[PDB]
Design an enzyme around this catalytic site. Structure first.
Site: not given
Length: 710
Positions: A473, A554, A641, A680
């Protein structure tokens, strides 16, 4: 292999914008309009090539069948008491949504309290936030449709599970906090806007306000309690102190772990809640985080990072509030991050630390901060907890890479504290003893040692022959700690793979210094860190470039997309979920303005110069070397999203297909799938989760030609 043709996609060669003297062409800018016939035809043409590619090889059905079988295990949340009753969430295994149950005692018969599954045929209406009244007799809950961040708040009387008429609309990124008089509830709402508010729009969200809803009235009568007309990005969330006396207002601007903290002593209101409250601006800046733990009269205990990047507990006395007077109740640790703190059984504190990316759990005395008890845990994560101040017991949920996990219970009224297993489920089909988890620390380009977990079958040869799945991430103070994923374990067991999770900078794993190491001018550290993780796995013989898949969602979708551009030679396959790809325009849409605390904003010349260097949309380039092509790439997004508007992935895939897909040397596919009735990811129904992971692993299997291992 490539039996399809990429769709024709119009290039608007007139779309040219000057950024501080740097001209940028944006020929697919038209994909920013989700409602146009052009955009809808684009999405349809892309899905028309992706879906047959994913569904063609038998491996998808094998993977889907195994996922359906192995993911069918009972899933519980912690029990939690509210007033006279206990509640818990439970999924028998494959229900689209978990169900909220109630019982009158721990030994008592449970009944269904709220079942979101009956709200839609396909499981696309989900719970998003809830709050019980202080006495436990009333219940507010948010519902989101099709995965949007938008919420409708509804209400029930707990006794008899009676639906009430109260409905609150225009709710997004909201608090839910009942006054202890039971009269009503604080929440947030946005002002009316032109066009849609269903999760398919791109409109920016500004001017969020704090309202108070009196139970039994229409929303039009709700009281405006705080607003920030000169500061359109501020968001003020309310909570009540444990004794009901104070409303605490935490004001955020952006995504950094900082907040203003104002308070209202409700007893000092002239005639109850009738308008803008008499706010006392205790902390009136954005220099630090103040997270309320508890109070005893005017002495308020907060978790803070103020000059304490690993976090600590402080007491601020509202009657002597100057900073030089604050007491340090639990000082900061040199390395371990204080992740969260709860107050339970009047005068205990539960502290959860992160120690080298693993959780620990401790009981402390409220008055002195002294350590009283360690709750022992295996290597993994605490992912659930219950126990408020007036309660006399705790529940907590532990998980790890190899076990679905354990709910523990501890009765804190006992002189000798004894945590006990309360619920434990095992997945048959996966024998945990066949696998091992190791943690290593590898040096990045600048010499910084980065943690990485690696999960693999015991006894494998480190000869480079194994497919690997490397996840990261890297941002937003989010720590990527061990979690149970049947989907990844099927890749290990049934595709012979190695799983790896790299704790790159930008995360919260080593506190605010770790976070600041992966933001703003230093965002490239994230990408360097992740590329070095891949180099480690290859050098050490876990895998080889042609067998390596990277994945992120993301801000992790940005991570893997930038890595494909910067080191296409390093990766065989890239799956970017719901990724932010246009780093020059992300702040224009929905809540994107909030992310400038990690990324910067292209309105600044200084920030533009950072962003332009790594923005995935702006760095698609044919590799110079004849023998190097782009990895196989799959972008996953969905039409609701509204967190990361899907235009990011639409413009990026158009660019990939035009610049790279047209080249004769490119034989790896570059595909997008845009789902419907999804957003999302929060609240996504089980059925959609199963399809998504089956897509991911079918793409990996087909692109890398991996055989199923039954």
């Amino acid at each position: 292999m490539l039996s399809f043709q990429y769709p024709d996609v119009y290039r608007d060669e007139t779309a040219i914008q000057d950024y501080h003297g740097h001209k940028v062409c944006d020929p697919y800018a038209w994909l920013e309009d989700p409602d146009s016939e052009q955009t809808k035809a684009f999405v349809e043409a892309q899905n028309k090539i992706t879906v047959p590619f994913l569904e063609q090889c038998p491996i998808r059905g094998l993977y889907k069948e195994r996922m359906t079988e192995l993911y069918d295990y009972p899933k519980y949340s912690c029990h939690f008491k509210k007033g006279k009753r206990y509640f818990y969430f439970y999924n028998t295994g494959l229900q689209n949504q978990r169900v909220l149950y109630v019982q009158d005692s721990l030994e008592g018969e449970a009944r269904v309290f709220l079942d979101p599954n009956i709200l839609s045929d396909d499981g696309t209406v989900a719970l998003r936030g809830y709050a019980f009244s202080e006495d436990g007799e009333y219940f507010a809950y948010g519902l989101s449709a099709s995965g949007s961040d938008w919420v409708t708040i509804k209400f029930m009387k707990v006794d008899g599970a009676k639906e009430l008429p109260d409905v609150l609309e225009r709710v997004k990124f909201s608090c839910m906090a009942w006054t202890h008089d039971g009269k009503g509830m604080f929440y947030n709402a946005y002002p009316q806007q032109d066009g849609k508010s269903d999760g398919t729009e791109t409109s920016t969200n500004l001017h969020q306000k704090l309202y108070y809803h009196v139970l039994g009235t229409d929303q039009s009568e709700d009281i405006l309690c705080a607003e920030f007309p000169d500061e359109p990005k501020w968001m003020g969330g309310a909570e009540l102190s444990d004794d009901g006396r104070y409303v605490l207002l935490s004001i955020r601007e952006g995504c950094d772990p900082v907040n203003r903290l104002w308070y209202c002593d409700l007893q000092q209101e002239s005639n109850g809640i009738t308008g803008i409250l008499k706010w006392v601006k205790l902390i009136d800046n954005f220099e630090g985080e103040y997270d309320y733990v508890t109070n005893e009269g005017t002495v308020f205990t907060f978790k803070t990072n103020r000059h304490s990047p690993n976090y600590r507990l402080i007491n601020i006395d509202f009657t002597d509030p100057e900073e030089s007077k604050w007491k340090v109740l639990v000082p900061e640790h040199e390395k371990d991050v204080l992740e969260w703190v709860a107050c339970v059984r009047s005068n205990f504190l539960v502290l959860c630390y992160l120690h080298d990316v693993k959780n620990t759990l401790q009981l402390h005395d409220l008055a002195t901060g002294a350590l009283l008890k360690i709750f022992p845990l295996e290597v993994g994560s605490v992912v659930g907890y219950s126990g408020q101040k007036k309660d006399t017991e705790i529940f907590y949920q532990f998980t790890s890479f190899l076990s679905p996990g354990i709910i523990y219970h501890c009765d804190l009224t006992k002189e000798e504290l004894e945590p006990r297993v309360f619920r434990e489920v095992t997945v048959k089909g996966i024998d945990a003893s066949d696998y091992q988890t190791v943690q290593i620390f590898y040096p990045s380009k600048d010499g910084t040692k980065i943690p990485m977990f690696i999960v693999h079958k015991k006894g494998i040869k480190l000869d480079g022959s194994h497919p690997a799945f490397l996840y990261g991430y890297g941002g937003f103070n989010i720590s990527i700690t061990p979690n149970y994923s049947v989907s990844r374990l099927i890749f290990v067991r049934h595709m012979g793979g190695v799983l790896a999770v790299a704790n790159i900078r930008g995360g919260g794993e080593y506190g605010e210094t770790w976070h600041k190491g992966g933001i703003l001018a230093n965002k490239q550290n994230c990408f360097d860190d992740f590329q070095c993780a891949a180099e480690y796995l290859i050098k050490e013989g876990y895998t080889s470039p042609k067998r390596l898949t990277i994945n992120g969602g993301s801000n992790g979708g940005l991570l893997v997309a930038t890595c494909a551009n910067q080191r296409p030679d390093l990766f065989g396959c890239v799956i970017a979920q719901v990724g932010v790809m246009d780093m020059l325009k992300f702040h224009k849409y929905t809540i994107g303005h909030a992310w400038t605390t990690d990324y910067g904003c292209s309105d600044s010349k200084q920030h533009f110069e950072w962003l332009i260097k790594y923005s995935p949309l702006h760095n698609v380039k044919l590799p110079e070397a004849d023998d190097i092509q782009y990895p196989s790439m799959l972008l996953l997004t969905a039409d609701h999203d509204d967190r990361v508007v899907p235009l990011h992935s639409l413009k990026f895939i158009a660019t990939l297909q035009y610049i790279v897909g047209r080249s004769r040397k490119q034989n790896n596919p570059l595909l997008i799938h845009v789902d419907t009735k999804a957003g999302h990811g929060a609240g996504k129904p089980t059925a959609k989760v199963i399809e998504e992971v089956s897509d991911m692993f079918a793409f990996i299997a087909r692109c890398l030609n991996i055989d199923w291992i039954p």
